[PDB]
Amino acid sequence: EEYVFESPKMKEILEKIKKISCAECPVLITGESGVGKEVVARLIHKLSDRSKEPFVALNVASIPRDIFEAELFGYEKGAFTGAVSSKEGFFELADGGTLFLDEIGELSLEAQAKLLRVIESGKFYRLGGRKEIEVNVRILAATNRNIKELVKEGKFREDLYYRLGVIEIEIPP
Amino acid sequence: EEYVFESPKMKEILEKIKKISCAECPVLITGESGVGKEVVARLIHKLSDRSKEPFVALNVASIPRDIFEAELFGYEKGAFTGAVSSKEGFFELADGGTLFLDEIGELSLEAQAKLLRVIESGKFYRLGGRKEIEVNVRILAATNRNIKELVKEGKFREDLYYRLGVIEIEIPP
Amino acid sequence: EEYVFESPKMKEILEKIKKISCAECPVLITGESGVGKEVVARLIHKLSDRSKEPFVALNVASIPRDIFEAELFGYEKGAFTGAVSSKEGFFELADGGTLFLDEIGELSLEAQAKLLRVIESGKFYRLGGRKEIEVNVRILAATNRNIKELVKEGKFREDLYYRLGVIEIEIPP
Amino acid sequence: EEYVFESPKMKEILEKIKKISCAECPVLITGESGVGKEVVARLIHKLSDRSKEPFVALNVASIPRDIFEAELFGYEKGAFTGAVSSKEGFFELADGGTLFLDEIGELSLEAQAKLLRVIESGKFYRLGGRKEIEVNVRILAATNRNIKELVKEGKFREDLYYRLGVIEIEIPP
Amino acid sequence: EEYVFESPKMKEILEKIKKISCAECPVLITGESGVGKEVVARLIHKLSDRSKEPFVALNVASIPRDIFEAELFGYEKGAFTGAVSSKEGFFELADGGTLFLDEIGELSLEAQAKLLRVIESGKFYRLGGRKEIEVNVRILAATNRNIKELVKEGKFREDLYYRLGVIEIEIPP
Amino acid sequence: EEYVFESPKMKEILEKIKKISCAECPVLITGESGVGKEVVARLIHKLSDRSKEPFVALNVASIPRDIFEAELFGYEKGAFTGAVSSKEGFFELADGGTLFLDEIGELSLEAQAKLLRVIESGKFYRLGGRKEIEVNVRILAATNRNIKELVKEGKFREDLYYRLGVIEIEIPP
Amino acid sequence: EEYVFESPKMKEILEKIKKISCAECPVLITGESGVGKEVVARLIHKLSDRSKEPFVALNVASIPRDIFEAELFGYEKGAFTGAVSSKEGFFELADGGTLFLDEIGELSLEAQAKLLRVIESGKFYRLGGRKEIEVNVRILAATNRNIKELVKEGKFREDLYYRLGVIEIEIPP
Amino acid sequence: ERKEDIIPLANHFLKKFSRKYAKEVEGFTKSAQELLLSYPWYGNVRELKNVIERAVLFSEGKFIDRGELSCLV
Amino acid sequence: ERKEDIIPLANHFLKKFSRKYAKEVEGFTKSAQELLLSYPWYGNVRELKNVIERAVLFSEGKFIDRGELSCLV
Amino acid sequence: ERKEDIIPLANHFLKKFSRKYAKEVEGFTKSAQELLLSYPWYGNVRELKNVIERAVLFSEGKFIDRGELSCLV
Amino acid sequence: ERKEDIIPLANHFLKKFSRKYAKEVEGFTKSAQELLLSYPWYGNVRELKNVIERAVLFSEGKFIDRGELSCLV
Amino acid sequence: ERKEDIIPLANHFLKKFSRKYAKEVEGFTKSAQELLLSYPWYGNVRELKNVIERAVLFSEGKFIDRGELSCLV
Amino acid sequence: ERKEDIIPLANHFLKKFSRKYAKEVEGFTKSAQELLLSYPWYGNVRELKNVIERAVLFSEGKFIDRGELSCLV
Amino acid sequence: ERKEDIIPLANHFLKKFSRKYAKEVEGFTKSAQELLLSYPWYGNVRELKNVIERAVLFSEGKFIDRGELSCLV
Ligand SMILES: Nc1ncnc2c1ncn2[C@@H]1O[C@H](COP(=O)(O)OP(=O)(O)O)[C@@H](O)[C@H]1O
Ligand SMILES: Nc1ncnc2c1ncn2[C@@H]1O[C@H](COP(=O)(O)OP(=O)(O)O)[C@@H](O)[C@H]1O
Ligand SMILES: Nc1ncnc2c1ncn2[C@@H]1O[C@H](COP(=O)(O)OP(=O)(O)O)[C@@H](O)[C@H]1O
Ligand SMILES: Nc1ncnc2c1ncn2[C@@H]1O[C@H](COP(=O)(O)OP(=O)(O)O)[C@@H](O)[C@H]1O
Ligand SMILES: Nc1ncnc2c1ncn2[C@@H]1O[C@H](COP(=O)(O)OP(=O)(O)O)[C@@H](O)[C@H]1O
Ligand SMILES: Nc1ncnc2c1ncn2[C@@H]1O[C@H](COP(=O)(O)OP(=O)(O)O)[C@@H](O)[C@H]1O
Ligand SMILES: Nc1ncnc2c1ncn2[C@@H]1O[C@H](COP(=O)(O)OP(=O)(O)O)[C@@H](O)[C@H]1O
Ligand SMILES: Nc1ncnc2c1ncn2[C@@H]1O[C@H](COP(=O)(O)OP(=O)(O)O)[C@@H](O)[C@H]1O
Ligand SMILES: Nc1ncnc2c1ncn2[C@@H]1O[C@H](COP(=O)(O)OP(=O)(O)O)[C@@H](O)[C@H]1O
Ligand SMILES: Nc1ncnc2c1ncn2[C@@H]1O[C@H](COP(=O)(O)OP(=O)(O)O)[C@@H](O)[C@H]1O
Ligand SMILES: Nc1ncnc2c1ncn2[C@@H]1O[C@H](COP(=O)(O)OP(=O)(O)O)[C@@H](O)[C@H]1O
């Protein structure tokens, strides 16, 4: 059988997804919990040119704020007591495919920045030093909070907003 | 001689214990203080397949909330000023046997989570880093408070409830 | 010359002291201010087997409730801004001898507990960590308030009562 | 020219001052406002052996009750948000000389005690910790209220009374 | 054209203002509502040496009695929940110029004092701590109530009266 | 069909409403209970330029005098035991539209003032602190009592009268 | 076409730039964000004798305070784990040309000093050791904060102020 | 107590508002000017400010007389 | 909101466990099937998973009805 | 504050993307051009860059008007 | 609620201590045994443990009756 | 209660201020000196300090008498 | 309640201080000794310690009687 | 505290720079010389060194007065 989309506003949103097909600009999805955000990311990617490519979805809340900037990107050896190898990255694992960051508002100012730098340059370095890796990952942010607000609270970098705010989809409860 | 069970509701509860015998799903016991909760855990385990195996009962109230997440699981060296060796665990001591957590409601949100993760995965890590130990311990939670309530108070993780709520026994005063 | 005991009830209490001689179970003395409590402790100890041993009397009121749990027992280095050495203890100074805690009711719930643990185990640790010292001190509590009452007020641990309530002497005004 | 004393009761009080000369025991002066209390302190000290030594007079009312126990004695660093250096003391400034505490009744129970301790031991510590300073200051209390009364009101420590009540001068309106 | 003064008593008061010119001692203006008090302050200052300097007039009634001692002077950071910066002051804004406190009687005893201290010393501190600012402001108090009376009611500090009572002008209805 | 206006004095009042159309100055409506006051407000607003904009009518009697100054404006967090978020406002909800305060006489002196300040400045702060919000709301007061009278009773601020008394409509029984 | 300067104060500032032409003394530019500071630096340099020479503008905020003293100047090999070659410098890259340090206040005390030394001597060494390089770079500092203030806060070296304060331009918002 | 102010002020106001609400109102008639001078103006300058914003809005032609004013004053 | 799922799912589960604990339990009775469909299932699929592992263990014969279920649901 | 830039810039962008995603989009309609000029453009040039890449992709025919734009602006 | 325990327990204790403090105490008298059974024993087994260590020490002869006990119970 | 102080003090003050505000004021007249001695001086030395700074400023010629003083005292 | 202590103690003290302040004070007179015994001594031993240091200093000759004492007691 | 230095020093500097930047600047005017002497010179000799290199460059004619200086001092 199939999936489920039939209400006007969604009859719509599906198409918006379909059009966005041939694209790679990041996408910002927003709706209350349960509305289908992460279901749209997944669909956007099933529809993007890189459907067959991996889907690296990671809940930004499912990781202590102090280790996100260690697992998203990666880690350069001996910089934090105990390192079995410079740590790879979800960015690197998502290289060539999609990287669905769920619950964006929960990004530390430090990573909010560090992401921005990788959304524009596409290059990143694991900790102190310089970039030595090439990643081609389409950003897909989804959050249930109101981004704009957070911007006047200073909890959310504005320039990072507009950067992910290329394509913006809003799922109605 | 013997032990004591003769009232209908208990004439019952004993059997429920007997049936549960061949199982390992966690069990949630609840009754006012003194009703026989910890007496049932002990009996459940005397009856489980692992009776001959250890019984690691630990009162969650008999340890300052800040050191529970250091003794239940274990501790990775030099993470807290002074560490004679990465600390073992009641989980590790209870490996292969039962782990009767008394007075569950008294679990910090941080450990309530950390337990859940070990009830599903069965793997755990001592502090920051990753899991490197294999523990096979049957969870047996007993509390005298009303769990459900605590869930609307936000003091008790719901998903951790249903996880321990596989088998639920309620001892009447 | 001598000391003073001649009224029946005291003609008595002296003997009770004399009998208790060959003992070490804690003793709970109670009478209005001035009745001779601290005079009896002192006599109990002059009569115990450890008379020649030290007498470490300490008024529980003569120390701010927040520093009692730092001087009775002892203190593990760097746990409170400024520590010249892990702090010894009146318990340790009273090791081998008597420890007359005057005005017991004035014990914080935290120490009331911490004492209990040392009345049974006899081992104690200075702050967070574990016991590494051996103390043999006979507890001698004296208070002018009515313990029992305090128990229904929750200001006084019951189990700590019965523990010190091994031998109980009551000095009549 | 000179100063003014000619009435019998004062023709007297002057002498009492003169005799007290060779002494250092604290002195308690009491008379209605304006009667000449602070004029006698000053004279007592002009006559004591330490006349050439400093005179540290401080109105106990001229300082908010919450900062007296911070300026009389002194202050150990970082114990109250913002400390440029552990605070010296009027006690320390009055070391070797007289310390005329005016309007004693206005002493907080906490300092009334803290003074007593320094009238007997002569040693004091700035906040929590221990004494590390040596002060030789002659106490000179003057108040216009009736001390005794205050003692039955519990607003004034009795033992601190008798301690300052070594030498007592009463100036008649 | 011009302003308006022609009655004898005012033909006068103008001159008194003119003479006072070369001065800086505070001035106390008193007359029924509407009589021209605040019109005289303004004129006194137009005539003082510091006419070109600012005129910081502030109605002592136009601010809740609990925030006057926070805005007149200033405020030292984190002393009251929420502080964006240690608060400046009308005293500091009036530094170098005039500070016309209207309706003086409406000063809290706490500020009545705090003002006095700044009328004599000229130095002030924002909350607890010490003075770290230099203000040269000429005080100009105007009230419609009878000061003296208030002094027997204890609602008005006397010494603060005589301090502002250097130059006193009374505007007849 | 339509609404109802046909008597001369009302044949009139309708027009007065129509003219007032292009305005925003507050309006003061007065007539016995039931005369049609709240029906005129509603019509004034249906006719003002902001008809399509919201109509925030609130009975000043339908709220305990102690919580009006908490709901009209808004509330700054933790200032009154229990605050889930700094409270929004009917002023803020009425921003951009009309705010029909019914039964004005029932305004506490404290709010009567607080309103005045917002009728002139248009800025307001939720409790202690400063204004941080921008509200454009047209005031529409209606009361059945005689305002003027209340002014000689001191129950109603005069300056607040003339401020709302820009446009005044009186509905005859 | 052209650029934009037409207001008096700027009609001015342009000229000041033009005059400064034939110079090399550092220049201190200050104005609120966006006022055109970095637009003036750029113009100063387009006008200096070294216009054809490079323009090395570097935001002092666009680099973690711990790596500025590693990239501005340069780095002597093996002094920090991992060094592919003793690191060159923006100072060295700016040799012969301008070095526009934006947001000066954001300079660590350590570099504030290290810059001063290079503004006077013109010689610098990469880390520990001695100078072995010759750099001829005209300093151009621009900050939006008030330097002077920072000097009383101790966050900004004074002597470094006057050194850059040779020529000072202030852009009005 | 400044009847020499009422007519000038009023005229100020009538100008402000006539321009604020785009009303072709030029000024007060004699009959009106009288009234304005007789009213006690308890509110004073303030009350006149209102009385006229109100009269400017209520205005129908190019002038204001006993008509709109009496409505208030 | 998928009552068309409760009975199939439940039946899935009853199979899993009946095989996991070697219990001769074939399935639910009508009386039981009703209950399962009426329960609100706040936990949803999860809660039903538990409710039935539990009911499989508590099971005595070949079927499950109001009996074991009511114990919970 | 450069409304004389919105329409030219926008037109730049619409060209970039129309070519980047191979879309037969020639340009904005009047109705659309208006909107673009009225929007406040807080993001400024940046926001317009996005608003139009987005509008180029969402584009269905040869032109863009109130339609796709309103979706955003 | 185990009066059938008081007399046996008590007797346990009286033995422990009689041996711990080298006291020639053999056991309780009837009169005493009664009391022990009537006391409510809030502390229960614990309180009896103490009550008797205490009674063993206070003991003078070979037995314990209302005498030493009443002192407490 | 030191009328022997008023005239000397006063004279001190009149000197301070006469020099502080550059006023050619030499001293008080008899008529004035009397008044100063009769005033009760509740403020005492303080009040006289003020009364005279004030009288020095108000001073017009070289002396001070009932004139300026009565203004206050 | 130890009047048998007042006179001996007192005498202790009078010795301490007489030596501490180098005063030729040998002891109390009868008249004085009486008083000391009648005083209630609320402060007890402490108060007597003070009362006499004080009396030793106030002392003029070789003895102390009603004189210096009454000053206090 | 060496106002006798400001004018000579300044004059030193004005010479250095006038020669360093090839500017036909001979010296300060009275009006200017005054200012230089009144300025507090917190930086002292250093600040004057800068203030004048700066004034030499800003210089337009042969002299310097309130003009260029006020820009700073
Ligand atoms: N439009 C839809 N059609 C069918 N199923 C949906 C739809 N939207 C959501 N779901 C379902 O609801 C669940 C909630 O999904 P999800 O989108 O991940 O939550 P959230 O929006 O908070 O990230 C999913 O398991 C999915 O199967
Ligand atoms: N059903 C029972 N039969 C015999 N003894 C029991 C029974 N229930 C409880 N007890 C006794 O009561 C005491 C209280 O036991 P426990 O179950 O541990 O308390 P809680 O239920 O609060 O954990 C135990 O020491 C035990 O011997
Ligand atoms: N039975 C007694 N015989 C002789 N002196 C006693 C007796 N009881 C108390 N005292 C005296 O009374 C004083 C009060 O003593 P203390 O027992 O310490 O008070 P409290 O009972 O409040 O602790 C002691 O200094 C002691 O010398
Ligand atoms: N016996 C005296 N002889 C001379 N002057 C005195 C005498 N007593 C008080 N004074 C004066 O009276 C004033 C009040 O003094 P003071 O003793 O400080 O007040 P109080 O007794 O309330 O502390 C002093 O300034 C002092 O000069
Ligand atoms: N002498 C005067 N000449 C001209 N106008 C005056 C005079 N006195 C008062 N006024 C006017 O009266 C008003 C009331 O002024 P104000 O002095 O501020 O009141 P108050 O005396 O209660 O402070 C002012 O607006 C002012 O223009
Ligand atoms: N002029 C009118 N024409 C038609 N209905 C009216 C008119 N005036 C009042 N009403 C009706 O009478 C009721 C009373 O309305 P309301 O104006 O709100 O009372 P009040 O004047 O006391 O605020 C309304 O429900 C409304 O429908
Ligand atoms: N005077 C000016 N004339 C023309 N454009 C200017 C002018 N001032 C600033 N700008 C423009 O404004 C922007 C802000 O520039 P910038 O000077 O770098 O900011 P800041 O002053 O904070 O360093 C630049 O992109 C520039 O094109
Ligand atoms: N003299 C005047 N000329 C023109 N308009 C005035 C004059 N006085 C007051 N107004 C107007 O009347 C209103 C009354 O203002 P305000 O000065 O605040 O009165 P008050 O005397 O009570 O302080 C103001 O909003 C102002 O625009
Ligand atoms: N549609 C389903 N069919 C069969 N079993 C299911 C179904 N959905 C969930 N389950 C079972 O129920 C449990 C709930 O799983 P889960 O997918 O993690 O729920 P959630 O929607 O909260 O992510 C799983 O362990 C799984 O075995
Ligand atoms: N049934 C018993 N028989 C003999 N002695 C006992 C018995 N129960 C308890 N005791 C004694 O009484 C004390 C009470 O012990 P405990 O078991 O800790 O009580 P609780 O039920 O509160 O856990 C113990 O020190 C033990 O020696
Ligand atoms: N005896 C005096 N001779 C000259 N001036 C005095 C004399 N006493 C006080 N003054 C002046 O009068 C003012 C009153 O001062 P102060 O000593 O503080 O009074 P008080 O007795 O209340 O402490 C002082 O500022 C001082 O300059």
Ligand SMILES: Nc1ncnc2c1ncn2[C@@H]1O[C@H](COP(=O)(O)OP(=O)(O)O)[C@@H](O)[C@H]1O
């Ligand atoms: N019995 C005594 N004989 C001699 N001097 C004593 C005696 N008792 C007390 N003193 C003196 O009196 C003072 C009271 O001392 P202290 O023992 O502390 O009293 P308290 O009973 O309140 O503890 C002591 O400083 C001591 O020198």
